[PDB]
Amino acid sequence: KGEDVPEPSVPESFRVLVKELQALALDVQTLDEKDNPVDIFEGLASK
Amino acid sequence: DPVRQYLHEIGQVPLLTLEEEIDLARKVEEGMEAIKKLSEATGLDQELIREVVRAKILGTAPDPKTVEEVDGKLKSLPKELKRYLHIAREGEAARQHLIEANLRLVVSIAKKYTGRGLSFLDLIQEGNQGLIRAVEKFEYKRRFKFSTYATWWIRQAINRAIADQARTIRIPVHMVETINKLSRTARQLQQELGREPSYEEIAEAMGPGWDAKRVEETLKIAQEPVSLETPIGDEKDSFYGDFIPDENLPSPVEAAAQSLLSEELEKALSKLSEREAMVLKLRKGLIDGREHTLEEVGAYFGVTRERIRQIENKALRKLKYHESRTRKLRDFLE
Amino acid sequence: DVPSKIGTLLDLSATELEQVLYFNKYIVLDPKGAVLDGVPVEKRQLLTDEEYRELRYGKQETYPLPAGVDALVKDGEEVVKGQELAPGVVSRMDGVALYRFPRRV
Amino acid sequence: DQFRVGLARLARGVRERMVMGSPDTLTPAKLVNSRPLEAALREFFSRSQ
Amino acid sequence: KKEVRKVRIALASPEKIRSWSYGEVEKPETINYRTLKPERDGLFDERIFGPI
Amino acid sequence: ADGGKVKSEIYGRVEVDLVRNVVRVVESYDIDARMGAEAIQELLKELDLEKLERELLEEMKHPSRARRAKARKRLEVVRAFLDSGNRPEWMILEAVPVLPPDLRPMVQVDGGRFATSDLNDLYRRLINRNNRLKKLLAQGAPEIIIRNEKRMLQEAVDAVIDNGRRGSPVTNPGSERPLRSLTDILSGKQGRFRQNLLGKRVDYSGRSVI
DNA sequence: TATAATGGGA
């Protein structure tokens, strides 16, 4: 559509790493500038 | 080695004499009958007394409420009816020792079923389930040794287990038996021919009701799946699944094509009146996913089946006209 | 893990932790004043299931008798270690002799 | 060399077939299989570097 | 909206593990041998993991 | 019995005898001794980490090098849970997570035959054993049986985690290849921590002689 | 649903 290609908000290699770590019962927290939780799964796996 | 651990544990429990075997089986049947006469005296269910007796025997720890209040009611009974409480308790103790003393028999039977998809300990534990069901409805009055009834139940529970758990993709029981019948015949004719059979000759060996196409399709389901982690080549940097394409996920070109199609159809439908377009979207399932017949669409718009058909036909040849001039939708057509 | 984190927190060797987690030995949460082999049993003590059943379900020893032979003791009669509950069948423990299966009445 | 390897694996295919069956009369036809030697030479010509 | 700047790793409690879960896999079944659809309480069930 | 006329004078288990019309009490304590991860979880749940810190700090001011080195390592673990907020019993699992299906897929390839991921059979062996333990507890099975299923359960869980680490690795029928565990998915050369570093095949690329 | 069958195997 003649648009500049956008950047991925959260790459897929990031998502797979977290779920494969959660599979081993390890809480992987993705924190931002002030240490608050960022949900790298936008309404997809958040319940 | 967990097998040596379990064999040593069942080793501590000595075997039981024919006198003990009759006595334990007696107390079991007496306890079971003592429970039924408590369901008449007190009035509550069999399984309730069954578990309250099992609790107070095999372990200390609703636990403070329901369990203890049922036992308390049982404790507050006349002497002539509290006999059956004591008889049920020791009867449940007899069931425990009857099981423990014959765990040695479960191993002696389960070891023959190895190499069928379930480990040894899985072959022992489903067999132990047969030993429990064997005890629960064993009647010693027939004067048969406990080993005869158990052996039938150990084999029933192991065969049933292999039919339900060994396959990754679950297969019916008769098909498993069928697949075993097929698998036994191909090995003796391999020895007779010196080579593996074709589907016609193994079908001729299977008997009536078996042809070359049925043996091929039943053997087709018989094979277990391949592992995606099957290594390819001596190099330790590639699995099988590393070379398998994703047949179900759409490609970037496919994903765009469906979006361009939905966009170009919207632009095409915008050349119609909103009723003309809404009729077509209802008839083709673009709204909720199901093709609405002329009746439902006429009910929506409050007109007849024929009036909807004319709207639908007029809307189509308007689309065909615009399509003959723009040619936007001529492709997407496979 | 090469240095066990659970074994470190509770002060258990890898051999001790192996026997507990994989059902080789019990461990004492509450001794309830138990004693064995001339010593008490402290908390966090490892003991075999033989020592567990003796300390929790009691110690009993059964002696089979040669057929037709009678016993020198009576039913529910207290015994002494070394006593002769049957000729040649010496008592190995203090307790109460209980007849289990009588053939003559 | 890989031939006698498939024979040493056919040797087991003979040794163990003797404890079973009718040890009095067994033909070497049902005592010997083509599967051991066939799979030995095929591994050589198809897999050996 | 906010940008991830740190990643922490820690232990997962049972209630936290259950917080990640969309359901309990109650059965060892996978797909039906005939329909090839996922089984209702198995490892591929759409009722928990999502639609196909 | 007798509404108070007779009382036991020693600790022990009871059993009411109806043939002799007697009540005997065997010298047996009500001791609490447990096996398995249930026992370890309780010990981890009862640890006062603050007291163990003071208890170990006063041990590393002892002159002996060996025991103040043992207390030194033992304090590193204690300080970790304290400063992090991790409750030590969390190292024992009650709920086991399950990876999403498309990361452990099951699909049919050419020829109609199916191809699946090893993790599925590991989960499948865990679900089978866990379900058998459930309907053995409900049936009121003796302890030798329960202990066996609990051993096989622990051996099923840590095979999902790290197949091969302890014991013989679980394999499929008809092969000696160990099934790939969750740890093999992260660790190693094909692991997820090496995947991004080692590079990838890329779209919008070509090749030719120059 | 019942003859009896009771500690693995590389």
For C52-57, which contacts have Cβ atoms below 8 Å and span 24 or more sequence positions? C52/C26, C52/F31, C52/F33, C55/F28, C55/F29, C55/F31, C55/F33, C56/F28, C56/F29, C56/F30, C56/F31, C56/F33, C57/F13, C57/F26, C57/F28
B223 Rama sector, left if φ>0, alpha if ψ -120 to 50, beta otherwise? beta
Q: Give the type of residue at D22.
A: S
Q: B121 is written with which tokens?
A: 């300990």
Looking at B167, B189, B204, which one is the last position of a domain?
Answer: B167
Instruction: Give the length of chain B.
Output: 334
Please indicate, yes or no, whether residues B145 and B194 belong to a single structural domain of this protein.
no
B60 contact C CB<8A:
no
Structure solved via: X-ray
Please indicate, yes or no, whether residues B217 and B254 belong to a single structural domain of this protein.
no
User: Whose CA is closest to B190, among D13, A24, A25, F202?
Assistant: D13
Tell whether B122 is covered by a domain: yes
What whole-number distance in Å separates Cα of residue F203 and Cα of residue B164?
45
Please indicate, yes or no, whether residues B161 and B191 belong to a single structural domain of this protein.
no
Find out whether B96 and F142 touch, Cβ atoms under 8 Å.
yes
Q: B82 is written with which tokens?
A: 């509290």
Q: Which whole-number Å values give the CA distances from B31 to B39, B43, B74, B132, in the listed order?
A: 13, 17, 15, 16
- Is B2 close to C22, i.e. CB distance below 8 A? yes
Label residue B44 exposed, middle or buried (CB < 10 Å: 0-12, 13-18, 19+): middle
Please state, as a whole number, how many other Cβ atoms lie within 10 Å of the Cβ of residue E48.
19
What whole-number distance in Å separates Cα of residue F47 and Cα of residue F112?
56
Find the DSSP H helices in chain D. Answer: 2-15, 35-47
Please indicate, yes or no, whether residues B160 and B178 belong to a single structural domain of this protein.
no
Q: B140 is written with which tokens?
A: 């010693």
DSSP state of C69: P
Label residue F192 exposed, middle or buried (CB < 10 Å: 0-12, 13-18, 19+): middle
What whole-number distance in Å separates Cα of residue B158 and Cα of residue B109?
9
- Is F172 close to B241, i.e. CB distance below 8 A? no
Please indicate, yes or no, whether residues B296 and B274 belong to a single structural domain of this protein.
yes
- Is A13 close to F98, i.e. CB distance below 8 A? no
Characterize the bridge pairing of strands C89-90 and F114-116.
unpaired
Q: Does chain A touch chain E (at least 3 C-beta pairs within 8 Å)?
A: yes
Please indicate, yes or no, whether residues B133 and B176 belong to a single structural domain of this protein.
no
Please indicate, yes or no, whether residues B36 and B155 belong to a single structural domain of this protein.
yes
Find out whether F130 and F153 touch, Cβ atoms under 8 Å.
yes
Encode chain B in three state secondary structure: CHHHHHHHHHHHCCCCCHHHHHHHHHHHHHHHHHHHHHHHHCCCCHHHHHHHHHHHHHCCCCHHHHHHHHHHHHHCCCHHHHHHHHHHHHHHHHHHHHHHCCHHHHHHHHHHHCCCCCCHHHHHHHHHHHHHHHHHCCCHHHCCCHHHHHHHHHHHHHHHHHHHHCCCCCCCHHHHHHHHHHHHHHHHHHHHHCCCCCHHHHHHHHCCCCCHHHHHHHHHHHCCCEECCCECCCCCCCEHHHCCCCCCCCCHHHHHHHHHHHHHHHHHHCCCCHHHHHHHHHHCCCCCCCCCCHHHHHHHHCCCHHHHHHHHHHHHHHHHHHHHHHCCCCCCCC
| Nearest protein residue by Cα to C1' of nucleotide G6 | B105
C23 Rama sector, left if φ>0, alpha if ψ -120 to 50, beta otherwise? left
Tell whether B237 is covered by a domain: no
Looking at B121, B150, B167, which one is the last position of a domain?
Answer: B167
Report CA(F28)–C1'(G6) in Å, whole number: 31
User: Whose CA is closest to E24, among E14, E11, E10?
Assistant: E14
Number of domains in chain B: 3
Please indicate, yes or no, whether residues B177 and B162 belong to a single structural domain of this protein.
no
Report resolution (Å) to 1 decimal. Answer: 2.6
User: Whose CA is closest to F31, among C22, C52, B54, C59?
Assistant: C52
Tell whether B198 is covered by a domain: yes
- The CATH number of whichever domain residue B208 belongs to comes to 1.10.10.10
Q: What sign does the dihedral B274-B280-B286-B289 (CA atoms) show?
A: positive
Tell whether B260 is covered by a domain: yes
Find out whether E43 and F124 touch, Cβ atoms under 8 Å.
yes
C37 Rama sector, left if φ>0, alpha if ψ -120 to 50, beta otherwise? left
C84 beta partners: C90
Q: Does chain F touch chain B (at least 3 C-beta pairs within 8 Å)?
A: yes
What whole-number distance in Å separates Cα of residue F140 and Cα of residue B136?
12
Please indicate, yes or no, whether residues B9 and B158 belong to a single structural domain of this protein.
yes
Of F95, F100, F131, which is closest to E14 when you measure between CB atoms?
Answer: F95
Tell whether B321 is covered by a domain: yes
Please indicate, yes or no, whether residues B104 and B182 belong to a single structural domain of this protein.
no
Please indicate, yes or no, whether residues B129 and B13 belong to a single structural domain of this protein.
yes
Find out whether B133 and B125 touch, Cβ atoms under 8 Å.
no
DSSP state of A37: B
Helix axes F65-84, F49-57, angle to 10 degrees: 150
Write phi, then psi, for B142 (nearest 5 degrees). -75, -15
Residue of F nearest to E43 (CA): F101
What whole-number distance in Å separates Cα of residue B9 and Cα of residue F144?
7
What whole-number distance in Å separates Cα of residue B120 and Cα of residue B105?
14
Mark which residues 248-277 of B lie under 8 Å from C by CB: none
- Is D34 close to B194, i.e. CB distance below 8 A? yes
Q: Domain range for residue B76?
A: 1-167
| Residue that has been written with the tokens 């304590």 in this structure | F29
- Name every residue in B having a CB less than 8 A away from some CB of E: 165, 168-172, 221
What whole-number distance in Å separates Cα of residue C100 and Cα of residue C64?
10
Beta carbon of B145 within 7 Å of strand G?
A: yes
Q: B310 is written with which tokens?
A: 């004319």
User: Whose CA is closest to E28, among B149, B178, F161, B118?
Assistant: B118
Tell whether B244 is covered by a domain: no
Tell whether B62 is covered by a domain: yes
Pick out residues 62-101 of chain B having their CB under 7 A from any atom of nucleic acid strand G: 101
CB pairs under 8 A between B and E: 13
Please indicate, yes or no, whether residues B16 and B144 belong to a single structural domain of this protein.
yes
Set of chain E residues whose Cβ sits within 8 Å of the Cβ of F193: none
Question: E5: helix, coil or strand?
Answer: coil
Beta carbon of B7 within 7 Å of strand G?
A: yes
Nucleotide with C1' nearest the B151 CA: G5
Q: Which helix (H) or strand (E) is F71 found in, with range? A: helix F65-84
Angle, CA B235 vertex, CA B229 and CA B240 arms, to 5°: 25
Find out whether C45 and C19 touch, Cβ atoms under 8 Å.
no
Tell whether B243 is covered by a domain: no
